Symmetry: C2
Subunit: 176 residues, 2 copies
């Protein structure tokens, strides 16, 4: 019944936004889609500019606009979109404008757990534990959006759903 | 000088649209972006429906619309977009509508070369040589768009650029 819905599975790198989104996307029922929104900057090469700071001003501004547009595309055509990426409350209004019901869920976990998960990642994502840790500290104050945080430290990969995210989707966490 | 431009690096699976696009995207100069448009259906899980046929009616219709939209996003903000994906002349008008200059280049290679490149791919792309071969045969008639084909059989990975794609970009292959 969550067709035409979008989910912002935000959280600090290492909280497993991906794993929880993929697995939730592979969930039976209505057609889902695990949208790894981070692929938007991963697509740009030469003039990359890390999303850490500071020139990520207009870059992110854009990548955000796209991502929000793409979410609507799938949504409009009855789908349950799930964006696996950081989406701070600053850009929230860039997603409500989609006149579609979106659920917001921020994952948070121990800094040691976050550094761990990302440690052995290499690839092109977060590696250096300093960055992962620094970015984690920042993701600590969600202002008046805290009731939107889902701690999953005391849980594992599949314990982070039923009594976690899955329960949130139904728990009316945030319909729109 | 090809900023604000889009390139449809189409061709049959195995002609190396990716390798040629990535490497061309990693090219110095203006900020480029290797847009692996195929990631659009790769994002959907459960209700997937292979892009081979037949229910790929409204699925592709959409995935196409998105992809064309996303290309404009990058383009508008001065970039040289490069889509690594099949884009038959049927959907061409879905890209010209972007009121931006786009270059169209179709890669073609021996069916044995195409079956080869894709053979050892596994992952989630083209594996079975029957499919790769069948899809290849189909990609043989480009109607009145043949002058848009770039054969790269008698060339290797880096011989498929200077006297190939790179030369096409400048050769005014198709500015708009």
């Amino acid at each position: 019944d969550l067709g035409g819905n979008i989910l912002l599975l935000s959280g600090h790198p290492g909280s497993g936004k991906s794993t929880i989104a993929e697995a939730l996307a592979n969930l039976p029922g209505v057609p889902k889609v695990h949208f790894h929104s981070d692929d938007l900057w991963g697509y740009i090469k030469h003039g990359r500019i890390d999303p850490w700071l500071p020139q990520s001003h207009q870059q992110n501004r854009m990548i955000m606009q796209i991502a929000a547009d793409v979410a609507g595309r799938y949504a409009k055509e009855g789908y349950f979109v799930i964006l696996d990426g950081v989406v701070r409350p600053d850009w929230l209004p860039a997603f409500t404008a989609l006149a579609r019901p979106l659920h917001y869920i921020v994952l948070r976990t121990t800094a040691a757990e976050a550094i761990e998960r990302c440690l052995d990642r290499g690839g092109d994502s977060l590696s250096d534990p300093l960055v992962v840790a620094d970015l984690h500290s920042q993701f600590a104050d969600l202002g008046a959006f805290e009731h939107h945080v889902l701690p999953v430290s005391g849980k594992d990969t599949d314990q982070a759903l039923q009594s976690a995210i899955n329960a949130l989707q139904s728990g009316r966490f945030r319909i729109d």
